[PDB]
Structures are given as structure tokens and as C-alpha cells.
């Protein structure tokens, strides 16, 4: 645990993760692309949809 080390009362928002992604990944792979994932059947471009 690292509760007292980095967690702040304002909420340590530096700890990010990929929650939405098109497919499962192969072992030993990393991804840093940040494109907006079409979670619905409609396509969407720009900055949000």
C-alpha cells in the first residue's frame, strides 16, 4: 500500500489508466495513444461526442 505516501486529501488524480479500449492486448505491450473511443455505434470525431 502507498496510502500515506502519495494520496492527497484533494484526490491524487495523477494515477490514470485506460478504461475504454477496442480490444484486448497481447502480453508485454503498452499503449499511449489517447484517441476518443467510439463506445457507441455512432462514429464521433473532434474532441467529444
Amino acid at each position: 500500500n502507498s496510502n500515506n505516501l502519495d494520496s492527497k486529501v484533494g484526490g491524487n488524480y495523477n494515477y490514470l489508466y485506460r478504461l475504454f479500449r477496442k480490444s484486448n492486448l497481447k502480453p508485454f505491450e503498452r499503449d499511449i495513444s489517447t484517441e476518443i473511443y467510439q463506445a457507441g455505434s455512432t462514429p464521433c470525431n473532434g474532441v467529444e461526442g
Binding site: 502480453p27 508485454f28 505491450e29 503498452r30
Partner: protein, 49 residues
């Protein structure tokens, strides 16, 4: 070769005497360099002088 984040470099240098063609012969390939990089690679280009 690129398998599981691992880039394998095998080589053989040979003195020859031929102007255009690929000769018929047999000599195995010793491994030279492994690199534990971890990139998804799809294309490659050689570079001349």
C-alpha cells in the same frame, strides 16, 4: 525478428565474387544482438548512401 518485445539480430558476412545474382551456397546464421525493446512494428525501410 521481433517476438515478445525482443528484437533478434542474426548475421553473416561473406567475401564473394559476383556482379548481380544471388549465389547458391550454404552457411548458417549466428545470432548477434538481442534488444528488449517492445514496439509493435509493421513496416521497415533500408537507407542508402
Amino acid at each position: 525478428k521481433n517476438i515478445d518485445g525482443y528484437f533478434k539480430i542474426y548475421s553473416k558476412h561473406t567475401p564473394i565474387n559476383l556482379v548481380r545474382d544471388l549465389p547458391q551456397g550454404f552457411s548458417a546464421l549466428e545470432p548477434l544482438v538481442d534488444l528488449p525493446i517492445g514496439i509493435n512494428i509493421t513496416r521497415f525501410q533500408t537507407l542508402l548512401a
